[PDB]
Symmetry: C3
Subunit: 143 residues, 3 copies
Amino acid sequence: VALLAAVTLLGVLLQAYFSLQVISARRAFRVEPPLTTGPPEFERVYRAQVNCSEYFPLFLATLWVAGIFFHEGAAALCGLVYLFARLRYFQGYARSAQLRLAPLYASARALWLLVALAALGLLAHFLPAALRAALLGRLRTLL
Amino acid sequence: VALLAAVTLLGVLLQAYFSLQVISARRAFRVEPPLTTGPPEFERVYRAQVNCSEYFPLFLATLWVAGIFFHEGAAALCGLVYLFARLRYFQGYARSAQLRLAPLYASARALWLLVALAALGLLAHFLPAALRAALLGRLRTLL
Amino acid sequence: VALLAAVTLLGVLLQAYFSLQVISARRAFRVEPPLTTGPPEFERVYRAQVNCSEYFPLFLATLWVAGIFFHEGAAALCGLVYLFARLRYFQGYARSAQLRLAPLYASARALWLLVALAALGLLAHFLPAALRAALLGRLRTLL
Ligand SMILES: N[C@@H](CCC(=O)N[C@@H](CS)C(=O)NCC(=O)O)C(=O)O
Ligand SMILES: N[C@@H](CCC(=O)N[C@@H](CS)C(=O)NCC(=O)O)C(=O)O
Ligand SMILES: N[C@@H](CCC(=O)N[C@@H](CS)C(=O)NCC(=O)O)C(=O)O
């Protein structure tokens, strides 16, 4: 699990960092809490952090299931570029709501294929035992 | 864990699907990002996905703790109807903010009772060792 | 893991409780769903629950990685005061957007240091094997 736990720890650092950079723009544009609406910039910056936060648990499950049920090193490698394609994404959204697109592509690319591995790995586990049960019942005296 | 990991993988698929269906309504009603406010429909559809996303980690913990510390097959069965009662929920909220209620009931039903199992299972683990410690100290020479 | 699973179960209870208390203020100030905007109170109460929900997965990872890869009892103890410093936080934000600060301090205090432990623990695991690989290659005939 160690690499998986390393990648998750990056994720959490990355998430906390966006979170801090939202507090920064909240300061800059004098957007008093609990207001989450102001200039287009604060509204874009705050939005990135909000989308990253809603994709984090999806990324943590499936990272943990792609390692463990498919290969780990494979899973942790996707997990890694995904997080990078999310750093760049929040960097982008801060600039513009189109500088968010390029890294949002690299991110969903890496976020599926993690689903593919976790999917394959789980089928690689359930299918044999199923087909064994399927055939065993359908035998029946085999005369 | 395999069933637990199967149910979590469904969860992640279900979450990603809502996410995509929000992008669809974001397209339809021409709601340029980062705006999360428009017609009542986009505001309802976007809202479902936002509530589902905030209940996902609560559901992932407790799924994993109801299996493992109480029975797994039991946990995975609740996990399963919960996700269905969330598919139907987002389907509902899209229609109306009352067509969301019926599956929101079936969902909190399944989301507690998962807390009940995870609760029971954890007490089934800590209580014995506690009462053993309680009695051992209160002995004391037992004359 | 049992304490870690106990602390996570508290987290989930705490999260569900905020969630219920938002439904309460949603009722009180007649804020029909899917509106997430009204009086300053509903806007503060709803905001606390929204921030707590975005910090929960960050707290669940790192709790699980601070136990397991550093000491558990240590991890579960931080996890515990963090959740308390989040109960108090939502209590605070309900009162005012400054009665939120005091427990938000106690919370980020406990949320890092959990990152510190998970960080230390993961370095305590990877560094030896690395320096072993570093030295082994740089030998080379040691004449
Ligand atoms: N990551 C958080 C920063 C800390 C937080 O949870 N903010 C709280 C208390 S400081 C808040 O008032 N939310 C308003 C906001 O969206 O910044 C965020 O970006 O919202
Ligand atoms: N599941 C996401 C879809 C992808 C996403 O994270 N959206 C980002 C970048 S495409 C955004 O700009 N958020 C605005 C929104 O709420 O749709 C969502 O429903 O928001
Ligand atoms: N924890 C949730 C309560 C249940 C929920 O997910 N609310 C849904 C369906 S009842 C909703 O319509 N969201 C509007 C809201 O933010 O309360 C929350 O505070 O939003």
